[PDB]
């Protein structure tokens, strides 16, 4: 069943009940201020690092889930509710949330009282603003106050948490009942000491009264669904010192019927110079000239209504691209919108926070940035080439790579380190991946240090040879590359032998040594070894690059040879040498991630779909019987059902979830595009819509999380909970899905030369156009496609049939008319 | 106002309402296994380690506060409601929660249903036991379903709630409806990996049904006090797989008018041998032999009843060596009961858990683990020696100490390290105490190694060498101890310098050298010099004794005078050398510290109370002035107003709270124990009134936390909060009143040669008589006291009057008769 629609007109998933299966999401802020908003307005706000600079709290795991965010109890004649249904829980007349892009409405209505709310972050903002409106829709007159809150944050979000020995007596505000423009609060822990920031929290009129101490407006003994305040009809006027520290204002309301108000209401990130951060020659009141400044302009609704404009116009403008048009509805708009919006809020948002990430932890994995960077490129082209740049600036001279990445100060995390050998390569993905949508090899020239050593500057193509030299002089017994840590599977841990609780499965190595070899990194280095080769040739290089295909083509042997288990790819060889995901064994015979990642890079990839004998044929074969299920693939089969002590943290997941038996939603392209390879489209878009939201959409109560995101994990077949999902958001799923669709099923790809059309989608998609903008130019790429496995398109380029599948790059400003017949 | 009363004949404090200014709790647990119980049942168990350790989650910072703990919900006729009045808060006809050592009762009756429950952790058990009796107190018959309820937490307490993106698919149960002796709900949570452990939930009966996911039995939407099974009135009989497990059974029970039933119920930690680890060759099953073996040790009321009738002889034998009885039931009851009480909490919780410390940090300060060891070392003088051993173990052979001891592993904490130049000479204190109190001159030759490195081993004494040589060879250009990162104020970095947030204010040093001295260092340095002298000369060092003297004498005359600002003692030179604590300054003029400390060591004393030139007696009267308030005395005054980046954390708390103008109160007694050395008794015994609970109950409004045991932090007179405790139960003011009241106070106190008997306490206690068991033989101490400045206590012994105030140790077994007059 459904728990709410889409408004493709509108650009929002509209949710109808307040009774989802789970708290669904939206991410406000496009810059450095940030919003987490459920259809039940629980979340919070942070100014770029949600670990330190969180101005607002929010309680994970909490009972029930996501009591707690930005509220507004309305009371009526004594009758007090949320028009965001929790935490109140007064029946509603009308409830409904529309998540859109960078904004989101809630609106509830009860007892003739009608409250819309519109939540965003402006523009060139660093604060969260809400328009409400409230409209009385009875034949009576009504007189109501209307109480607003949020619950502050003491900054660290980490020490908020922990350390209440100090922290309960660190808590500051300033009143401002009489504000230019209203009435304001002013959060400001700590301005004292170190920091030269506070928030604000204010609303655009005269309030009657104000609290600033949760445990008064809430009372002792009750939840926010029990708070004293709004049910005693009046404001507390409470002061906090210490404690727990809020944002509330009380606004009387009189309304006849059908008459409406509307409030705007503003929470800001205020920083003052240093010089400048008092009002006061004593130094004990806040410089407020730049809090008054933000909120004069949401002094009223006109001004707030032109900066909402402003905010779609963004989100119009930058979602130019790429779009199609076809007989699916539901193919359209993951393609036009939702997979696009998820990519942008990914690197936005990096791994930061979610409903699942918490916000403490404030690295990513250096392997995933450039893997989001993949599906992002096509909008943000400049700030792709900056993050290349500055992820390659952490490498290490010797070409391996820091593990983790902290796009917040650009380095390196240090605990982590370092030694998990699929992570260089992943630089040469990013790079070949930005060139070939810009046409840039520019880049390959800018200066770039290692491990951000002041001195230490070479070309950036010169930290990609170090890139694949690393793999050269790491490989094994069977000249497969040594996988170290681990692999792109951060949970296939050989070198760790833990039996002792709390030792990091990913860090720990009781054993040094060994022998442990991946095919995943042997696939990786096929793929992206041949693109390093295609750049050192195109710049000149022309014994670098044989060399390079050189180690290719003998990386290739290996796989076909010892990586290969007669119907399908080995996974790896462990520490001893002994096969890992080879048929001989009762549990993990087969693993995903080799047999979808070495047909993408052409391994075993024999005359055509029909051709049974390819290995690649044998081996999506052997994926289609062992691993494919309604929900998606899962990562291996069977899963484990003991502790594998040889194996680290991949059989410690209870079957069916995660990597020991999870559908890991990331992969689940490598085998879709591979399908395509082969060719078998109809087979490649099956899988597609499996795992993909619009498609899940019908199943929202087995699914359970945002029908219009993409996911990590959904459980697998071994699980009870087969089928429903975790970890939505914030992973790499996102870019790994735009890549697939926009580029393999719809087989539209930026190459050095050219766009490539290269279409392979199957019957259920008959014709669709796409219109992509490359290079300053505009194909419209119209396709009449008959579905057949095996059946690649022709091209007529501007009325004229061409040979091959690939279009010269027009001239900026022109457009370019593409037919293609498959 | 009040909110109960103390029980003296239970040894128990009275709690008649829920509605206390906020959650009182208790611990219990004398071994390896420890709960935290609040009067609303609220809080968690752990055994040994409550970071990694963890049975059973808890909410801090909850709203509201304490919502989660065991519950037992009563459904009868459909209405539903919970003894402990939280999480349902259903009006309750009648409740009480009594506190006692080492288990508690709640009885909460409503509705003609009475239940009752004992909470313990027997003795030789690693379990949380509750015996709960239900009586039909109506005149009519009553069918009742019981549902407890335990929410599980993922052992490693600091994964459960921020590592949600793994733990959310790793909750696993087994449920047995059919155990040996009632039904067993398991929490096998990692036991398929690296666990040999697991928790078993149980009951003595047979569960008409059950639940283990907490989602079912709570239901969507709800909070604990609207859970959906107990309201429906039948077990959903869910059985968990990721997400939150629980522990929970229906017991059905009826009741004719008058009848009664009890249950036993049983939360118990479980460790297997590794071979052990299964009960099936599958390895699917966990091996439940030794959870039937405990579950059967508690399978009748009788053996319950019999385990805790053990457990009240276990803290009654305990508590057999100091006692007073007087005119004043509020003394008397401090001192017997809950001083001491509250003194082995300390010992065996260290810092780890309370209401405000929330169990993830796992060490407590060197200087903390031999200060608690001063007020539990007449209890339990075997265990005291070894934590001497133990901490001492972990010195740096230069003679400094690791900061921060982790008790778990016995190590010193790498990462905070070392540098707090106070923390070498509390060594000096905790072994000289051990020593008196046991005679035990045989710990100083005991091999003890530097930094745990084998083979590094010298005498414990050669030990206390190297702590007092460290002072010598660390002094400042006045002669003063360099304070380094701090000195028992953790909050006087006097070498951080820091101005960018999140830097830690005790390990950050921006700046090199610097000359800062420490007056508290100094008068430390005086006490303890004289003790480890005395030491040495007894062990035959006279070279050794009598330098050490002379380094003492040269430590004196710097404190009184280049330590000395004409009306009290500085509290320390900055890194520039400009005075800190001096009358010459707009804030901060006077810290308690140095005034308190340098007394109690004799610097500056003259002929008697008076003779007001005296040093001593001009610091004192000067922290009457300017520190005493009717809450205890404030650290320092006036309170700093602005940040002072050169002195650290100190000036970030706004007036009035913790180290910037708190009461804190671990350090009041260093003055009252001052003012019994100058020979004001009525003033020692009037400050040790205003901030001891006993005396504290009537006003449990202002104190807000529990009226029975000691708070570190009192608000200050310059905090609007002035009078409000945070921080109670772990904190060093718990030794150092029963230090305070029992040896100078009282006047009983330990020395090599003999008891000296010296009390000084004013004449609001007219007569009292101490019992005191000390080296084998028992002491009656009858004290007949006209409380006279400057009087002293003359002795008869057995009837004859001896000279001097020093009764010789008579041998084990003997009884001494000792009478004062003063
Ligand atoms: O292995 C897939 C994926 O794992 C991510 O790491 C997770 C992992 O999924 C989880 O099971 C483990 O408990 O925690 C780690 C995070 O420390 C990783 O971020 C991805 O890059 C990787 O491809
Ligand atoms: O300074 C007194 C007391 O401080 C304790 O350290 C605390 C301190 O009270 C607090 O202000 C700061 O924020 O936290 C630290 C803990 O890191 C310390 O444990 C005691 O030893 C010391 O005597």
Chains 1, 2 share one sequence.
Not at 91 to 116: C, K, M, P, Q, W
Request: glycine content about 10%; charged content about 20%.
């Amino acid at each position: 069943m459904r728990y709410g629609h889409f408004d493709d007109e509108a650009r929002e998933y509209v949710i109808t009940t307040p009774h989802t299966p789970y708290p669904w999401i939206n991410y406000l802020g496009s810059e450095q201020f940030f919003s987490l908003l459920s259809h039940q307005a629980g979340g919070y706000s942070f100014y770029r690092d949600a670990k330190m600079r969180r101005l607002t709290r929010y309680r994970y795991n909490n009972i029930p889930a996501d009591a707690g965010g930005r509220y507004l109890y309305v009371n009526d004649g004594g009758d007090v509710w949320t028009p965001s249904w929790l935490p109140v829980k007064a029946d509603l007349d009308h409830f409904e949330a529309r998540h859109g892009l960078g904004y989101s409405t809630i609106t509830g209505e009860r007892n003739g009282v009608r409250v819309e709310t519109l939540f965003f972050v402006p523009v060139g903002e660093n604060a969260e603003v809400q328009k409400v409106t409230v409209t009385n829709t009875s034949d009576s007159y009504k007189s109501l106050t209307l109480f607003s809150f949020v619950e502050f944050c003491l900054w660290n979000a980490q020490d908020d948490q922990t350390n209440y020995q100090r922290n309960l007596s660190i808590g500051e505000v300033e009143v401002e009942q009489e504000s230019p423009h209203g009435s304001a609060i002013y959060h400001r822990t700590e301005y004292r000491e170190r920091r030269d920031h506070y928030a604000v929290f204010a609303v655009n009129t005269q309030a009657e009264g104000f609290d600033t101490d949760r445990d008064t407006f809430v009372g002792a003994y009750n939840s926010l669904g029990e708070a004293a305040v709004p049910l005693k009809g009046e404001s507390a006027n409470s002061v906090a010192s210490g404690w727990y520290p809020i944002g509330s204002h009380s606004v009387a309301v009189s309304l006849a019927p059908g008459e409406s108000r509307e409030l705007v209401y503003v929470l800001g990130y205020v920083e003052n110079p240093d010089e400048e951060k008092w009002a006061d020659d004593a130094k004990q009141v806040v410089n407020k000239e730049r809090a008054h400044a933000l909120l004069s302009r949401f002094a009223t609704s006109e001004q707030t209504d032109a900066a909402f404009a402003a905010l779609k116009d963004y989100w119009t403008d930058l979602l130019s691209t790429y779009s199609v048009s076809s007989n699916d509805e539901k193919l359209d708009r993951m393609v036009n919108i939702w997979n696009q919006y998820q990519c942008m809020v990914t690197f936005n948002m990096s791994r930061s926070a979610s409903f699942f990430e918490t916000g403490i932890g404030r690295g990513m994995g250096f392997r995933d940035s450039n893997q989001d960077l993949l599906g992002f490129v096509h909008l943000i082209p400049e700030r792709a080439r900056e993050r290349i740049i500055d992820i390659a600036s952490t490498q290490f001279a010797d070409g391996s790579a820091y593990h983790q990445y902290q796009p917040l100060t650009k380095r390196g995390n240090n605990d982590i380190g370092s030694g998990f050998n699929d992570d260089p390569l992943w630089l040469i993905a990013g790079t070949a991946a930005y060139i070939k949508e810009t046409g840039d090899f520019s880049i390959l020239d800018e200066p770039v240090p290692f491990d951000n050593e002041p001195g230490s500057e070479v070309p950036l193509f010169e930290h990609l040879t170090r890139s694949f030299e690393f793999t050269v002089t790491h490989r094994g017994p069977h000249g497969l590359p040594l996988i170290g840590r681990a692999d792109w599977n951060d949970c296939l841990n050989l070198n760790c032998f833990s039996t002792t609780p709390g030792e990091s499965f990913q860090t720990t190595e009781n054993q040094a040594g060994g022998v442990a070899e991946s095919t995943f990194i042997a696939a990786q280095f096929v793929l992206y070894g041949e693109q390093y080769a295609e750049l050192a040739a195109r710049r000149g290089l022309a014994d670098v690059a044989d060399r390079a295909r050189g180690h290719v083509a003998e990386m290739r042997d290996a796989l076909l040879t010892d990586g290969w288990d007669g119907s399908w790819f080995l996974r790896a060889y462990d520490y001893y040498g002994n096969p890992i995901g080879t048929d001989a064994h009762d549990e993990g015979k087969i693993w995903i991630e080799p047999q979808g990642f070495a047909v993408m890079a052409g391994v075993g990839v024999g005359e055509g779909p029909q051709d049974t004998d390819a290995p690649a044929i044998k081996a999506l074969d052997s994926v289609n019987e062992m691993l494919a299920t309604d929900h998606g693939m899962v990562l291996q089969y069977p899963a484990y059902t003991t502790y594998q002590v040889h194996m680290g943290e991949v059989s410690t997941y209870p079957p069916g979830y995660k990597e020991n038996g999870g559908i890991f939603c990331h992969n689940n392209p490598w085998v879709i595009i591979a399908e395509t390879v082969v060719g078998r489209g109809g087979r490649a878009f099956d899988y597609y819509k499996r795992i993909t939201p619009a498609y899940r959409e019908d199943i929202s109560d087995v699914h359970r999380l945002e029908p219009y995101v993409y996911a990590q994990m959904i459980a697998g077949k071994e699980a009870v909970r087969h089928g429903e999902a975790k970890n939505s958001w914030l992973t790499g799923t996102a870019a790994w899905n735009f890549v697939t669709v926009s580029q393999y099923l719809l087989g539209v790809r930026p190459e050095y030369d050219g766009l490539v059309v290269d279409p392979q989608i199957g019957p259920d998609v008959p014709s669709f156009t796409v219109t992509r903008v490359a290079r300053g130019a505009t194909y419209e790429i119209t396709v009449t496609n008959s579905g057949t496995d095996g059946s690649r398109g022709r091209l007529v380029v501007d009325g004229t049939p061409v040979e091959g599948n690939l279009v010269p790059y027009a001239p900026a400003g022109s457009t370019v008319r593409v037919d293609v017949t498959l």
